[PDB]
Amino acid sequence: LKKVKILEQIDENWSKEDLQKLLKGIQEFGADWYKVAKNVGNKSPEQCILRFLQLPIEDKFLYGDGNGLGP
Amino acid sequence: VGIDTHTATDIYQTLIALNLDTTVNDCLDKLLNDECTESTREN
């Protein structure tokens, strides 16, 4: 099916294990970013918050890629 | 004639929720069944 392959965001500043520890830490502790960056390790909490913002979660369920949606 | 934009938006919300729940339950079953591979179980 049209599944969201979330672990393909492995851009060189991050890694697949880093994204996995990020997701498991946010599921462990809700939005306490100091504990989340502690669980991930080797990264500031601002990078964790930024990479959590920039995840393409719902873009594969919306209509367009970027004609137009119209009204 | 051709005016309903509103029902289109509401059923668009409905269909987006449907496809999102389809992918969520697909990954949930592929992780919950271990008859699926770990590269789509732990993935």
């Binding site: 099916l1 049209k2 | 269909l15 449907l18 496809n19 389809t22 339950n25 697909d26 079953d29």
Partner: peptide
């Protein structure tokens, strides 16, 4: 709505079971 694989297989399973049900309850 697009599909689901287990939903489609269980749909054809339940449809064949209901068809055999109505064909075996008649005689």
């Amino acid at each position: 709505m697009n599909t689901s694989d287990s939903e489609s297989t269980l749909y054809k399973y339940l449809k064949e079971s209901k068809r055999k049900y109505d064909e075996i309850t008649h005689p």
